[PDB]
Each structure stands twice: as C-alpha cells, then as structure tokens.
C-alpha cells in the first residue's frame, strides 16, 4: 500500500514537471496569427521593431 | 521550473500595462506632464551613451590625443552597460521599444 | 590660415558625418540580424525540449 502511494506521488511529480515545462515553453511560442490580441510579446526577439 | 514560469509570467503581466506617452503640442509651454519612468530611464541611458559618443567625437576632431583619457572611457562604457542592463531588467521590452519610438 | 584650418575643420566634421552615417546604417542591419538569431535559437534549441 505504501509503495502504491509513493508510486502516485512519483507519477504526480513527473506530470508536474511535464506541465511545468509545457507552461514554460508557451512563453517562447510566437503567436503566428495577428488576430489573437491577447498574447503580448514577452521577449524583445518577438518585438516588432 | 515553477520558479522560472513565475518569473516570465510576471514579465508578461508587466508588458500588458499601457504606457501613455503625452502629445508634443509645440505651443503648449508649461503643463508639467510627468514623464513615464520607462521613457525617463531609456532617455537617461541613451543620453549617457550619447555623451560618451560625443566625447569620442570631440577628441577625434581636436588632434590633441591626450594619452590619459582611455581609462575614463572604459569606466564610462561599463557604467552604461550596467545601467543598460538594469533598464532591460526593470522594464518590459515592449515598453522599452515604445520609449525608443517616442524618443 | 584660420580659413584654411576652419576649412580643414569643416572637412573633418564632414568626414566624421560620413563615418557616422555609414556606422548607423550598419547598426540597423546588425539589429535585424540579432533579432533573427534569437528567434532561430528559440525555434531550433528550446521548443523541441517538451517532447523529449
């Protein structure tokens, strides 16, 4: 039973890392389509100078 | 990873903040309109660099290669770099670019 | 002599104006190159990590 709990914890942590990295990568994706107003460029590389 | 995401989210939030730049109506002397911090910081950093470049320019025209003026030049470059970096860390890139457009 | 010197002074200011103008045109191209380099780094090196 202890190993089953620990196994759930380990699966959760692995998923957290996957979610965390996906979130982190969302900050680097250039919104191709002009339309979406919402995603304000965070980086100057994406800045439309 | 969470710590890094939080940092980038803070930068995104700061980037959505509309910085209002006052209309240059020539005639209107006095109204003391307060200059946005980003525009001030960017102007100062650009002035500091301009002074530095101007000093290099003046020295090139006056042939008097005074041999002691190099150590002061470096310090001045470093000071600019540090300040420049601070500006890039304190303000969002969109705000800094907007400030440059206005200038 | 003054006129000659100041004629030479004007020549120096003009030669410098030429150098600055050339220098500012080169910087504009470099900024464009740096923007492309940063975008290329994000696309080639960072975006592929989530799949791994």
GROMACS .gro file of C-alpha atoms in nm:
model
  204
    1UNK     CA    1   0.000   0.000   0.000
    2UNK     CA    2   0.296   0.233   0.088
    3UNK     CA    3   0.460   0.165  -0.249
    4UNK     CA    4   0.125   0.237  -0.427
    5UNK     CA    5   0.114   0.581  -0.255
    6UNK     CA    6   0.467   0.651  -0.336
    7UNK     CA    7   0.404   0.545  -0.696
    8UNK     CA    8   0.110   0.801  -0.719
    9UNK     CA    9   0.336   1.066  -0.577
   10UNK     CA   10   0.610   0.993  -0.826
   11UNK     CA   11   0.352   0.996  -1.122
   12UNK     CA   12   0.222   1.330  -0.994
   13UNK     CA   13   0.567   1.480  -0.977
   14UNK     CA   14   0.654   1.353  -1.327
   15UNK     CA   15   0.325   1.511  -1.461
   16UNK     CA   16   0.401   1.833  -1.276
   17UNK     CA   17   0.734   1.850  -1.447
   18UNK     CA   18   0.565   1.789  -1.790
   19UNK     CA   19   0.301   2.057  -1.719
   20UNK     CA   20   0.562   2.291  -1.582
   21UNK     CA   21   0.783   2.259  -1.892
   22UNK     CA   22   0.480   2.300  -2.130
   23UNK     CA   23   0.384   2.617  -1.950
   24UNK     CA   24   0.736   2.738  -1.963
   25UNK     CA   25   0.753   2.670  -2.344
   26UNK     CA   26   0.423   2.860  -2.406
   27UNK     CA   27   0.615   3.174  -2.324
   28UNK     CA   28   0.854   3.118  -2.618
   29UNK     CA   29   0.590   3.037  -2.894
   30UNK     CA   30   0.538   3.339  -3.137
   31UNK     CA   31   0.159   3.380  -3.195
   32UNK     CA   32   0.169   3.335  -3.585
   33UNK     CA   33  -0.192   3.469  -3.630
   34UNK     CA   34  -0.203   3.853  -3.588
   35UNK     CA   35  -0.552   3.810  -3.465
   36UNK     CA   36  -0.501   3.691  -3.120
   37UNK     CA   37  -0.480   4.032  -2.936
   38UNK     CA   38  -0.403   3.852  -2.614
   39UNK     CA   39  -0.050   3.728  -2.630
   40UNK     CA   40   0.169   4.030  -2.557
   41UNK     CA   41   0.529   3.955  -2.671
   42UNK     CA   42   0.740   3.888  -2.359
   43UNK     CA   43   1.066   3.883  -2.541
   44UNK     CA   44   1.235   4.159  -2.748
   45UNK     CA   45   1.325   3.895  -3.011
   46UNK     CA   46   0.946   3.878  -3.074
   47UNK     CA   47   0.924   4.263  -3.055
   48UNK     CA   48   0.800   4.404  -3.391
   49UNK     CA   49   1.063   4.685  -3.416
   50UNK     CA   50   1.077   2.506  -1.332
   51UNK     CA   51   0.785   2.669  -1.138
   52UNK     CA   52   1.018   2.941  -1.024
   53UNK     CA   53   1.107   3.022  -1.383
   54UNK     CA   54   0.747   3.026  -1.509
   55UNK     CA   55   0.655   3.263  -1.228
   56UNK     CA   56   0.930   3.498  -1.334
   57UNK     CA   57   0.816   3.500  -1.706
   58UNK     CA   58   0.450   3.542  -1.605
   59UNK     CA   59   0.549   3.849  -1.407
   60UNK     CA   60   0.717   3.992  -1.719
   61UNK     CA   61   0.403   3.920  -1.931
   62UNK     CA   62   0.183   4.095  -1.681
   63UNK     CA   63   0.413   4.396  -1.680
   64UNK     CA   64   0.406   4.403  -2.063
   65UNK     CA   65   0.022   4.445  -2.080
   66UNK     CA   66   0.047   4.767  -1.887
   67UNK     CA   67  -0.026   5.055  -2.145
   68UNK     CA   68   0.237   5.324  -2.106
   69UNK     CA   69   0.076   5.664  -2.214
   70UNK     CA   70   0.323   5.898  -2.392
   71UNK     CA   71   0.199   6.288  -2.371
   72UNK     CA   72   0.117   6.453  -2.736
   73UNK     CA   73   0.401   6.707  -2.825
   74UNK     CA   74   0.168   7.002  -2.885
   75UNK     CA   75   0.455   7.264  -2.957
   76UNK     CA   76   0.271   7.571  -2.830
   77UNK     CA   77   0.174   7.447  -2.504
   78UNK     CA   78   0.455   7.572  -2.281
   79UNK     CA   79   0.418   7.464  -1.920
   80UNK     CA   80   0.197   7.178  -1.844
   81UNK     CA   81   0.436   6.975  -1.615
   82UNK     CA   82   0.312   6.641  -1.755
   83UNK     CA   83   0.507   6.361  -1.558
   84UNK     CA   84   0.732   6.159  -1.794
   85UNK     CA   85   0.678   5.780  -1.775
   86UNK     CA   86   0.961   5.601  -1.574
   87UNK     CA   87   1.039   5.388  -1.882
   88UNK     CA   88   1.083   5.691  -2.106
   89UNK     CA   89   1.300   5.862  -1.832
   90UNK     CA   90   1.516   5.557  -1.779
   91UNK     CA   91   1.557   5.496  -2.153
   92UNK     CA   92   1.633   5.865  -2.220
   93UNK     CA   93   1.896   5.874  -1.944
   94UNK     CA   94   2.062   5.559  -2.061
   95UNK     CA   95   2.060   5.698  -2.424
   96UNK     CA   96   2.196   6.038  -2.301
   97UNK     CA   97   2.468   5.870  -2.113
   98UNK     CA   98   2.572   5.686  -2.430
   99UNK     CA   99   2.534   5.994  -2.641
  100UNK     CA  100   2.775   6.187  -2.407
  101UNK     CA  101   3.011   5.906  -2.432
  102UNK     CA  102   2.997   5.902  -2.817
  103UNK     CA  103   3.014   6.281  -2.834
  104UNK     CA  104   3.328   6.277  -2.614
  105UNK     CA  105   3.492   6.028  -2.858
  106UNK     CA  106   3.383   6.260  -3.145
  107UNK     CA  107   3.533   6.578  -2.987
  108UNK     CA  108   3.858   6.402  -2.915
  109UNK     CA  109   3.887   6.292  -3.283
  110UNK     CA  110   3.842   6.648  -3.414
  111UNK     CA  111   4.078   6.829  -3.157
  112UNK     CA  112   4.404   6.614  -3.283
  113UNK     CA  113   4.526   6.655  -2.918
  114UNK     CA  114   4.540   6.290  -2.841
  115UNK     CA  115   4.568   6.347  -2.475
  116UNK     CA  116   4.717   5.998  -2.361
  117UNK     CA  117   4.512   5.955  -2.029
  118UNK     CA  118   4.164   5.973  -2.145
  119UNK     CA  119   4.121   5.587  -2.225
  120UNK     CA  120   4.076   5.462  -1.856
  121UNK     CA  121   3.783   5.708  -1.817
  122UNK     CA  122   3.632   5.578  -2.131
  123UNK     CA  123   3.609   5.229  -2.022
  124UNK     CA  124   3.457   5.317  -1.691
  125UNK     CA  125   3.202   5.518  -1.872
  126UNK     CA  126   3.117   5.216  -2.104
  127UNK     CA  127   3.082   4.988  -1.808
  128UNK     CA  128   2.863   5.228  -1.634
  129UNK     CA  129   2.648   5.239  -1.940
  130UNK     CA  130   2.631   4.860  -1.967
  131UNK     CA  131   2.526   4.826  -1.607
  132UNK     CA  132   2.270   5.087  -1.641
  133UNK     CA  133   2.152   4.946  -1.965
  134UNK     CA  134   2.113   4.605  -1.813
  135UNK     CA  135   1.923   4.744  -1.521
  136UNK     CA  136   1.686   4.908  -1.760
  137UNK     CA  137   1.628   4.584  -1.950
  138UNK     CA  138   1.563   4.403  -1.611
  139UNK     CA  139   1.341   4.676  -1.464
  140UNK     CA  140   1.115   4.736  -1.768
  141UNK     CA  141   0.943   4.517  -2.029
  142UNK     CA  142   1.094   4.503  -2.373
  143UNK     CA  143   0.768   4.638  -2.537
  144UNK     CA  144   0.779   4.940  -2.305
  145UNK     CA  145   1.149   4.999  -2.376
  146UNK     CA  146   1.082   4.982  -2.758
  147UNK     CA  147   0.781   5.217  -2.721
  148UNK     CA  148   1.002   5.460  -2.527
  149UNK     CA  149   1.261   5.445  -2.809
  150UNK     CA  150   0.987   5.517  -3.071
  151UNK     CA  151   0.876   5.819  -2.878
  152UNK     CA  152   1.234   5.946  -2.837
  153UNK     CA  153   4.530   8.038  -4.204
  154UNK     CA  154   4.224   8.037  -3.997
  155UNK     CA  155   4.007   7.994  -4.305
  156UNK     CA  156   4.223   7.703  -4.415
  157UNK     CA  157   4.223   7.549  -4.072
  158UNK     CA  158   3.848   7.602  -4.039
  159UNK     CA  159   3.812   7.479  -4.400
  160UNK     CA  160   4.004   7.170  -4.278
  161UNK     CA  161   3.784   7.174  -3.961
  162UNK     CA  162   3.472   7.160  -4.185
  163UNK     CA  163   3.638   6.878  -4.387
  164UNK     CA  164   3.692   6.681  -4.061
  165UNK     CA  165   3.330   6.739  -3.948
  166UNK     CA  166   3.216   6.618  -4.295
  167UNK     CA  167   3.446   6.321  -4.295
  168UNK     CA  168   3.301   6.227  -3.945
  169UNK     CA  169   2.943   6.278  -4.058
  170UNK     CA  170   3.021   6.034  -4.337
  171UNK     CA  171   3.154   5.777  -4.094
  172UNK     CA  172   2.852   5.813  -3.860
  173UNK     CA  173   2.605   5.784  -4.137
  174UNK     CA  174   2.783   5.464  -4.256
  175UNK     CA  175   2.802   5.341  -3.899
  176UNK     CA  176   2.429   5.390  -3.827
  177UNK     CA  177   2.327   5.209  -4.146
  178UNK     CA  178   2.546   4.910  -4.042
  179UNK     CA  179   2.394   4.900  -3.690
  180UNK     CA  180   2.045   4.886  -3.831
  181UNK     CA  181   2.142   4.569  -4.027
  182UNK     CA  182   2.308   4.418  -3.721
  183UNK     CA  183   1.994   4.461  -3.504
  184UNK     CA  184   1.791   4.286  -3.771
  185UNK     CA  185   2.046   4.002  -3.773
  186UNK     CA  186   2.043   3.973  -3.390
  187UNK     CA  187   1.660   3.951  -3.385
  188UNK     CA  188   1.670   3.662  -3.636
  189UNK     CA  189   1.948   3.487  -3.443
  190UNK     CA  190   1.744   3.492  -3.115
  191UNK     CA  191   1.433   3.362  -3.289
  192UNK     CA  192   1.630   3.091  -3.460
  193UNK     CA  193   1.775   2.980  -3.121
  194UNK     CA  194   1.427   2.951  -2.964
  195UNK     CA  195   1.292   2.751  -3.260
  196UNK     CA  196   1.593   2.517  -3.300
  197UNK     CA  197   1.710   2.462  -2.945
  198UNK     CA  198   1.428   2.536  -2.684
  199UNK     CA  199   1.098   2.443  -2.849
  200UNK     CA  200   1.197   2.079  -2.911
  201UNK     CA  201   1.261   2.001  -2.526
  202UNK     CA  202   0.895   1.950  -2.414
  203UNK     CA  203   0.865   1.645  -2.645
  204UNK     CA  204   1.179   1.483  -2.502
   0.00000   0.00000   0.00000
